[PDB]
C-alpha cells in the first residue's frame, strides 16, 4: 500500500498521499528514518493555501501541487542522501491519521545502480520426505537500491501466507562503500501440494529504479522501475 | 517538550509480557500522550491514547493492551500482556503540542523501541537441506530451518559465503510457524555440512547425505 | 485535578425591542466569557486577553463566517417553531453544547436546545439520538435523526475536539484558570440566641465544602447555609450558621485542603 | 413557563463604616432576559454603576452582577430595584449590614 520512488541527488521527487479523504482542511506531512524518531516536516492550510513549515527547514525545499478533488501531493528539491526515509500524511479524524506513506532513496551517483536478478530454487527432496513439507527459496542479487518488493503468486495469485522475506539486505562487499544487495525469501507449503504439477509457483521482484524522464547514456540498460520475476512448477518426482 | 524511550531493543517470547518505558516532560497540566507503531510492512498505526484521567484504544488491541500511566513519576508505559509474533514491530510514544487550532497540532515522539516476538517451536527439527538450484543459476543454496528459537544465527566466517539471518514462516493453513536461515555461496569446497560451521548448532542438528 | 467546563451558549429572540439585538452567541470557559458574537457587530470578538494573544487571525474571520451561517439557521428555526406552535409575540429560542471534564476522571459532553426557557431536545451521543419532549419536537427529530454523518460529526466534535479546545484554552489561560487563591475564614458573633457564622472570603475556585462540628462528632445537620457569591475582584464568598455553653469548630474544605478553625 | 429572577445585594469586603468598597446586586435565574436593574443612594439612584456582561446558566437561566464603589454611612441606605416582566412593578429589595 505504500508507494516507492528512487532518485538522484539534486533532483526533485513527487509524492502523493494515500489517506482514506482525498482534501483535509489541513494536511500534515511527516518523515521517519531509520535511526531517528519520525518528525513533522510541515503541514497544509487549505484556507490561507499555504505550507507553515518548521523553523529548521528552508521554504525552497517543499512545495504542494494540491489538485481539487484528489488527493495532494508534496515536492522536494535538490535531493541530498539525506533526504532518504519515508514521508507520511496524516490528518486528524479520530487521532493523527497516518496515510501509506511513501518511501525515498536518493544516490549522488547514478553510474552505480543496477536491476536484481531473480532466481528459485525447488524444495530439497530430504524435507520432503523428512517433513512432509516444501520450502522453494528464492534469492535477489545484484542490486544497489535497496528499494525492492518481493512477492509469490501461486496460479497467478498473491499469497501472504506461508511467505517469508528478509528485513534487511546484504552485502556483497562489506569493506564497500558503495556496494550491491542481495536478498532472499522463502514460501513453505504442503508437500501434497507442491508435488501437483498443475501448481505454479512464480516469485516477483518489483524493482524501483529511474522513470522515462530520466536520461541514460551507458553502454548497459536503463534501470527502470521494473518488476523481474522467476518461475517454477510442481514436481510429482 | 521532550520525550524519552529508556527501554532499548527486545526480543521476547510469544507468550511473555512486555512493558515499553516512555517518559516525558511538558509543560501541560494534562498532556494529551500517545502509544503508535511501526510495522516491518512500514505500517504507521496509532496503538493507544493516554490523558491523566482516560484512555482510548484501538479496536486491534483486544484487550492485549493497556498503559500504566502514573502522574507522579511522569510515566506513560505501555504493557502487552498476550503477546504474539504479529506485534514484531518498532514502538514510538508521542505527545501532542497545542499550536492555536486543534487540527494544526504537532506529534513529538520517542526515538523508537524496537520489539521482536519470536516464535516457541514445541517440537525443535534443526535441518540444514540443499536445495538444488535451477538451471539459471548455479549457486548453491542450504536451508537450516525448524529450529528453536533460541539458537542465534551468527554470520559468515568469510566472505565467500553469503548468510542470511534467522526468519520466521508461518503456515496459516496447518497453523504452524518454523524458523528458516539460507546461505549461498560459489566456491567449489562449498557443502552444507560446513555452512554453519560459524554458528552455535544444535547436537542433534540433521545432517541429510548428499547421495538421496 | 480540578473539573473544567467548555461550553457555548446561542440566543435568539423574535421582535425583540430595540435595544435587544436578535441573535447572541458566547462561549465560556469554566463560567468566565471567552467569545461573543451577536447580529450587530456581526463579527466574532475575544473576551480575553489570552485568546487573541495564542490564535491566528485566520481564527475570527472563518468562525465568524460560520456564525453569521449559525444566526441564519436560529432565525429560520425559530420562526418554524413558532408557526408550528402557533405562538404569536415575542419567544425565545436557546442552544447549548460543551463538555466537561470532572475531577473524578469521567468526562461527558451535552447538546441541548430549547424553546421559551424549557428543554426541547437533548443529544444522546452514546446512543447518537435525539430526545424530544413533544410531538412537534418528534417532528425535527426524525427529520435531524434522517442525516446521520451530522450526528456522527457532532458526536465526533462532542468527544474529541471539545476536550482539546478547552485543554489549549486552559493552557492559554493558565494565570487566570489555573492559578488558586485561598479563602479567608472568620468566626462572627451577631438573634434571641444569636448564631455564629462561619465565614470565606476571596477564594478563586468557587468550590468549598463549609461544615461544623461539636468536639469532634459532625452536626447532625442544623446548620444553616448561604449562597456562595462572587465579588467584584474574580473571587467568591460564603458563609455559614449553626446555633448553651456549648464548644463548636468549624470546618472548610477548599481545593484539596482541610482547615480547621476551633473556636 | 418564565421564572422571576433571584435579587442578591452585599459587599464586596465586610463593610466597615467610613472606608472605600464595592457594593454588588447579584441577579440571577429569571427565564425572560429583559430586565431594568439600579442602585439606590439614599432612596435615589445611584449613576456610577458598573456591570459585567450577561451570562447564561445551564438551566436555560441568566445571571448578572451590577457593582459600584461607595463609601458605607451608617445615615446612607443601599437598596437594589429591578424591573422584571414578570413583576407587576419594580421590587426593591435593601442592604442588610449584619
Ligand atoms: C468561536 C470558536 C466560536 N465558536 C462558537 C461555537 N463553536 C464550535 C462548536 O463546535 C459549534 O457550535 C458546533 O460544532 C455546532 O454544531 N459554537 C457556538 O455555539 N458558538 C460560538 O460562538
Known amino acids: 500500500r505504500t508507494k516507492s520512488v528512487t532518485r538522484p541527488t539534486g533532483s526533485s521527487a513527487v509524492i502523493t498521499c494515500d489517506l482514506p479523504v482525498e482534501n483535509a482542511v489541513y494536511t500534515h506531512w511527516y518523515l521517519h528514518q531509520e535511526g531517528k524518531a519520525p518528525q513533522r516536516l510541515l503541514y497544509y492550510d487549505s484556507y490561507n493555501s499555504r505550507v507553515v513549515l518548521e523553523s529548521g527547514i528552508s521554504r525552497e525545499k517543499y512545495h504542494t501541487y494540491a489538485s481539487t478533488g484528489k488527493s495532494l501531493k508534496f515536492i522536494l528539491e535538490n535531493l541530498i542522501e539525506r533526504d532518504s526515509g519515508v514521508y507520511y500524511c496524516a490528518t486528524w479524524d479520530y487521532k493523527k491519521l497516518f496515510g501509506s506513506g511513501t518511501t525515498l532513496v536518493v544516490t549522488e551517483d547514478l553510474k552505480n545502480v543496477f536491476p536484481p536478478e531473480v532466481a528459485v530454487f525447488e524444495p530439497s527432496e530430504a524435507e520432503i520426505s523428512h517433513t512432509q513439507k516444501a520450502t522453494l527459496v528464492c534469492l535477489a542479487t545484484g542490486f544497489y537500491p535497496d528499494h525492492v518488493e518481493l512477492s509469490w503468486w501461486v496460479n497467478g495469485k498473491e499469497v501472504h501466507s506461508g511467505v517469508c522475506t528478509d528485513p534487511q539486505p546484504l552485502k556483497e562487499q562489506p569493506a564497500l562503500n558503495d556496494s550491491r544487495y542481495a536478498l532472499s525469501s522463502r514460501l513453505r507449503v504442503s508437500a501434497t501440494f507442491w508435488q501437483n504439477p498443475r501448481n505454479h ?37 | 517538550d521532550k520525550v524519552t524511550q529508556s527501554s532499548p531493543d527486545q526480543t521476547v517470547a510469544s507468550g511473555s509480557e512486555v512493558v515499553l518505558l516512555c517518559t516525558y516532560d511538558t509543560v501541560y497540566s494534562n498532556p494529551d500522550l500517545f502509544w503508535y507503531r511501526i510495522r516491518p510492512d512500514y505500517s504507521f498505526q496509532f496503538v493507544f491514547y493516554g490523558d491523566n484521567s482516560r484512555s482510548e484504544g484501538a479496536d486491534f488491541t483486544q484487550g492485549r493492551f493497556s498503559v500504566k500511566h502514573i502522574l507522579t513519576q511522569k510515566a506513560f508505559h505501555l504493557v502487552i500482556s498476550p503477546v504474539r509474533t504479529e506485534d514484531s514491530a ?16 504537532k506529534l513529538i515522539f520517542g526515538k523508537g523501541t524496537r520489539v521482536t516476538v519470536e516464535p516457541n517451536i514445541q517440537n ?22 525448524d529450529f528453536d528459537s533460541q539458537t542465534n544465527v551468527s554470520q559468515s566466517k568469510d566472505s565467500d559465503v553469503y548468510i542470511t539471518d534467522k526468519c520466521v514462516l508461518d503456515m496459516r493453513s496447518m497453523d504452524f510457524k518454523s524458523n528458516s536461515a539460507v546461505a549461498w555461496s560459489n566456491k567449489s569446497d562449498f557443502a552444507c555440512a560446513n555452512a554453519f560451521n560459524n554458528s552455535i548448532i544444535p547436537e542433534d542438528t540433521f545432517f541429510p547425505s548428499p547421495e538421496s | 485535578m480540578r473539573t473544567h467546563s467548555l461550553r457555548y451558549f446561542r440566543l435568539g429572540v423574535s421582535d425583540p425591542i430595540h435595544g435587544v439585538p436578535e441573535f447572541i452567541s458566547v462561549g465560556y470557559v469554566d463560567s468566565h466569557p471567552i467569545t461573543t458574537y451577536d447580529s450587530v457587530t456581526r463579527q466574532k470578538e475575544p473576551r480575553a486577553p489570552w485568546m487573541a494573544e495564542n490564535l491566528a487571525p485566520d481564527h475570527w474571520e472563518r468562525y465568524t463566517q460560520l456564525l453569521r451561517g ?14 408550528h406552535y402557533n405562538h404569536s409575540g415575542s419567544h425565545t429560542y436557546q442552544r447549548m453544547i460543551g463538555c466537561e471534564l470532572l475531577e473524578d476522571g469521567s468526562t461527558t459532553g451535552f447538546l441541548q436546545y430549547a424553546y421559551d426557557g424549557q428543554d426541547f431536545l437533548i443529544f444522546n451521543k452514546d446512543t447518537l439520538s435525539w430526545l424530544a419532549v413533544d410531538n412537534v419536537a418528534h417532528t ?11 450526528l456522527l460529526y457532532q458526536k465526533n466534535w462532542l468527544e474529541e475536539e471539545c476536550i482539546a479546545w478547552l485543554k489549549r484554552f486552559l493552557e492559554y489561560g493558565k494565570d487566570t484558570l489555573q492559578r488558586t487563591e485561598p479563602p479567608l475564614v472568620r468566626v462572627n458573633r451577631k438573634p434571641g440566641v444569636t448564631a455564629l457564622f462561619c465565614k470565606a472570603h476571596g477564594f478563586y475556585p468557587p468550590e468549598i465544602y463549609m461544615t461544623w462540628m461539636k468536639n469532634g462528632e459532625e452536626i447532625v445537620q442544623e446548620i444553616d447555609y448561604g449562597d456562595i457569591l462572587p465579588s467584584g475582584d474574580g473571587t467568591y464568598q460564603a458563609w455559614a450558621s449553626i446555633e448553651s455553653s ?9 481545593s484539596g485542603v482541610h482547615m480547621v478553625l476551633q473556636v | ?16 463604616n467610613g472606608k472605600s468598597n464595592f457594593l454588588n446586586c447579584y441577579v440571577s435565574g429569571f427565564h425572560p432576559s429583559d430586565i431594568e436593574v439600579d442602585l439606590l443612594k439614599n432612596g435615589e439612584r445611584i449613576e456610577k454603576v458598573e456591570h459585567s456582561d450577561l451570562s447564561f446558566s445551564k438551566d436555560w437561566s441568566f445571571y448578572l452582577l451590577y457593582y459600584t464603589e461607595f463609601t458605607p454611612t451608617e ?12 413583576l407587576s412593578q419594580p421590587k426593591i429589595v435593601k442592604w442588610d449590614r449584619d
Not at chain 1, 521482484?205 to 536520461?215: A, H, I, K, P, R
Not at chain 1, 541514460?216 to 512448477?233: F, G, L, M, N
Not at chain 4, 445615615?75 to 414578570?86: G, P, Q, S
Open chain 2, 90 to 105: 518498532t514502538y514510538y510514544c508521542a505527545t501532542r503540542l497545542w499550536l492555536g487550532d486543534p487540527h494544526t497540532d
Open chain 1, 201 to 237: 509457483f512464480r516469485c516477483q521482484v518489483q524493482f524501483y529504479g529511474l522513470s522515462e524522464n530520466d536520461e541514460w547514456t551507458q553502454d548497459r540498460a536503463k534501470p527502470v522501475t521494473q518488476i523481474v520475476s522467476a518461475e517454477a512448477w510442481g514436481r510429482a518426482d
Open chain 3, 140 to 150: 425535527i427529530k426524525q427529520a435531524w435523526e434522517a442525516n446521520q454523518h451530522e
Open chain 4, 1 to 16: 413557563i418564565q421564572r422571576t429572577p433571584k435579587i442578591q445585594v452585599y459587599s464586596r469586603h465586610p463593610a466597615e
Open chain 4, 75 to 86: 445615615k446612607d441606605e443601599y437598596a437594589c430595584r429591578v424591573n422584571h416582566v414578570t
Open chain 3, 246 to 254: 456549648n464548644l463548636y469548630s468549624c470546618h472548610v474544605e477548599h
Open chain 3, 70 to 83: 449559525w444566526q441564519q439557521m436560529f432565525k429560520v428555526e425559530l420562526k418554524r417553531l413558532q408557526r
Open chain 2, 124 to 145: 525443535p527439527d534443526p535441518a540444514v537441506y540443499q536445495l538444488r538450484d535451477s538451471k539459471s543459476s548455479d549457486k548453491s543454496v542450504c536451508l537450516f530451518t
